[PDB]
Symmetry: D2
Subunit: 194 residues, 4 copies
């Protein structure tokens, strides 16, 4: 069955960018809930598809996307954050420069579209293997990033920031770059590019 | 495995309301395609679920809804049409009166929302089991009617009428009532109330 | 220009169901922001429609719905809450009983669909003037309730509850009934029914 | 006020790729209807905005997008078709090579996503001004291409092909390249790069 992954750091390790209380809730409550609900849904969807219970299989779809996406998104997110993440790899910086001009332009552009999400969602830097270029995108709710390989995600559900930042989502999006785990992001870029 | 159901009548049996050229293409090409694609998609979905490949399983959802819905919707539609439909059962008629005032009012209201569908989709009379009332709704593309039991569907994809009616969708929607299979609709209503 | 309405009570008056800090942020920051953005958008949409700038008018639509809906929804919401709201009017209780069986069934049913909103949104009790019945519905993000007259709304964006309830949205939805302004709700029902 | 533009050719001028019966219905009935409904909807929207009736203005958005998009899309489409299109300009061809490898690759990729549209909609070649690259996309129903400049559109509403091609959408999508107006597409590209 799907399981809640341990964080690769302690709950207070991202302070003062993301508080201990947020990390604890986000991991132990929000991500846990997705995982718990997903396992129930997965089991039902396996049942319905095996039996060709079509109307049921279709009805279960929103819940599998939401909870399964929730598990996917948060699992990537935890690996994408670090107290000391490093800097992009030489290859990744080179590609950032090619596709966005500079790391600064990428940060502004991804920060901007992420800030602009209406309601709950995620911003993503990804790598598109067909056109062989970095792209940025947003996703609603827990919809997983599709059509490109995820490299770095920014969660902008209110629960990702509210206890600390309250309504000031832009400050959280801007500050998250301070704890971007460029080691992990650079590894994901290398793997997407093999 | 899913199969294309035989029509319960011959291809020319609904003339002059729906042409035999339409019925043939609609069943032998359009429905058949949904069935053929459904079987493939269901196989791929069962594999993704068996492998625990969550992203892959989520990515197949639109195709399962579209082709699976296509199969559901058209399967119902063929049973909902007849040269000699009869009239609503007494219990269905009394319920049509309780919930819409008259059959006339129901036909007008459902015809109007069906005609108003933007793009491809369907109009439905359904029965809501929680509130024990008849309701009308539309669905986009091949999305199946959910949240109530389907009783009578009107397909307003352009392939359902264009060869005969061209752009004049309203003439098709108004005419289809003449071949509504009230025997089947009444049986579906009875089943929905069990 | 659209303006932020004053609350009909002081910021701490809904304690212990909704905290002073939440009321203050929700009103002075979140609702204010919708209003400020709406006025900018409204002015641009007036410009584009007057000039027949069609592609621009269409592009502005999501922002008008989001901010304009935000203004609509929160304006109703503040009037819907009270330290001592009273009980439903005789007419409204009678209708609740007819359409839902009891006030308890209505509360459970609306609470349930509201709890189930994926991401950000609202739950609503409304009155449908065509079929002359109470209904319940949900809306995504700030989409306004359409097709029926709003009577009572429950905001389930995370900002509506998080500082106090954290992840436990169900407790907030259940507790909000304690501060439902049945005087206001009963007035809205009478007005919808004239 | 919006008006139905004259076609830049006679109704039979695209045979055998698109029939004169199609061209006539498509322009005189389908496009004309979008134009007629657009003018009415725009008038209603201007009234709602003038009156400050926010709910009413928001409620008219789907109709403005659908009819307004309908007008935009078909207006472009007529200019995008010709018996004697010519060939891409040298700058457009060099850019097609830079962004897709070859014209062959572009035609295949756009044809495939266009064929894959579920229900009614459109395939587009566009130019993205931020990243100064060509891109391909699809749009649902009459949603206009947004976020990039439209260069070449393929209508895959069933009314665009059904009378000639019936269910065989792929034959229509593959054939339309033979009447793509590269003079117009090249002019649109040049304008997009200004
Ligand atoms: Mn989260
Ligand atoms: Mn059909
Ligand atoms: Mn709110
Ligand atoms: Mn068209």
């Amino acid at each position: 069955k799907h399981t809640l992954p341990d964080l690769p750091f302690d709950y207070a390790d991202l302070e003062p960018v993301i508080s201990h209380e947020i990390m604890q809730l986000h991991h132990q409550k929000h991500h846990a809930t997705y995982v718990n609900n997903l396992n129930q849904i997965e089991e039902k969807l396996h049942e319905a598809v095996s039996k060709g219970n079509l109307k049921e299989a279709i009805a279960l779809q929103p819940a599998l996307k939401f909870n399964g996406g929730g598990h996917i998104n948060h699992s990537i997110f935890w690996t994408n954050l670090a107290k000391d993440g490093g800097e992009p790899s030489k290859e990744l910086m080179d590609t950032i420069k090619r596709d966005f001009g500079s790391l600064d332009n990428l940060q502004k552009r991804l920060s901007d579209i992420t800030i602009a999400v209406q309601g709950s969602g995620w911003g993503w830097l990804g790598y598109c293997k067909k056109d062989k270029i970095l792209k940025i995108a947003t996703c609603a709710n827990q919809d997983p990033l599709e059509g490109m390989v995820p490299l770095f995600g920014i969660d902008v559900w209110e629960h990702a920031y509210y206890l600390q930042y309250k309504n000031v989502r832009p400050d959280y999006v801007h500050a998250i770059w301070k704890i971007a785990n460029w080691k992990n992001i650079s590894e994901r870029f290398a793997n997407a590019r093999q």
